Amino acid sequence: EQPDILSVGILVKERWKVLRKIGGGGFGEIYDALDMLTRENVALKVESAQQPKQVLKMEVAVLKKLQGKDHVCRFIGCGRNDRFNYVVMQLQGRNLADLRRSQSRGTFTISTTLRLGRQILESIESIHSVGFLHRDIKPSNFAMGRFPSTCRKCYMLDFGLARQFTNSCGDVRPPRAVAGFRGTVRYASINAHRNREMGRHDDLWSLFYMLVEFVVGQLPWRKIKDKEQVGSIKERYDHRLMLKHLPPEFSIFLDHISSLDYFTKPDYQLLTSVFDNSIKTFGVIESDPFDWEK
Ligand SMILES: c1ccc(Oc2ccc(Nc3ncnc4[nH]ccc34)cc2)cc1
């Protein structure tokens, strides 16, 4: 088949020494590199300069817009040449998709679920606040940090499928009649399935599906491969059934996101209160071990 975009061992811009490929899903590849200026390991994302769909221009735009914010990697560099385009950013640790799969039955406790969920909601409100939709909320786009000071922090890792949803000084942009969905079938909202323009609420639907999968270990459409068959299930599904294993205030969360549409700003403070109230009811404190620690 095709070789890796980068040969391990090469130096990018006389600074970043490529050490090992660490991922290859999506629209490119990701490497662990040594930054010889700062003398630290970093993540290096690359795409071929010839591939049909290139997303690192969006990655750089959103990463830069989010600098200073929580739950995002530090921006380190970027470039474009005849062979490849690249973006350099902070290296993180264990990926939530991997951590969930390491559990018995693929479930997290409500303690771990609520704390991760609240951090993920923070990260969604943050990207929305700078005028972008994520459009690809799924567990493999989040990781815990890899140091003592960062390993209790969850980071939003990738922005390739993002879209700017505001124009002028933060007016919502008129939606397109048709928008071809390129995200993940499992966590996609009904609107993605319908090839509708996605909104802020579609990222909150994907978070709702991730939280349910965290507590239950599976979604009702786990075994269905056909995208249209998944969409049909979601269109008809009584999402109240998913409240069974969530804390009671998730009825407020689900009622709220069900009420939303492309043109309606979410009540983020309401959704945050669901997590805050649930965490207090269950006596969860931030220092409690996550499931992978104990
Ligand atoms: C399912 C699918 C893919 C998968 O492998 C990943 C490898 C690296 C990443 N990305 C990152 N990792 C570590 N530090 C990072 N800073 C920026 C991005 C980044 C994400 C996933 C894990 C489970």
Side-chain angles (χ1 to χ4, degrees), residues 22-23 30 43 45 73 89-93 95 97-98 101 140 143 157-158:
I22 67 175
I30 181 169
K45 290 183 186 184
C73 295
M89 78 287 300
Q90 185 176 6
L91 184 63
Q92 302 298 354
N95 188 278
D98 293 338
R101 281 185 173 110
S140 66
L157 293 179
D158 190 89

Side-chain angles (χ1 to χ4, degrees), residues 108-118 211 214-215 275:
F108 293 135
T109 61
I110 191 59
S111 176
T112 286
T113 296
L114 285 176
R115 291 181 285 163
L116 288 181
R118 181 169 61 181
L211 295 166
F214 285 177
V215 297
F275 284 95

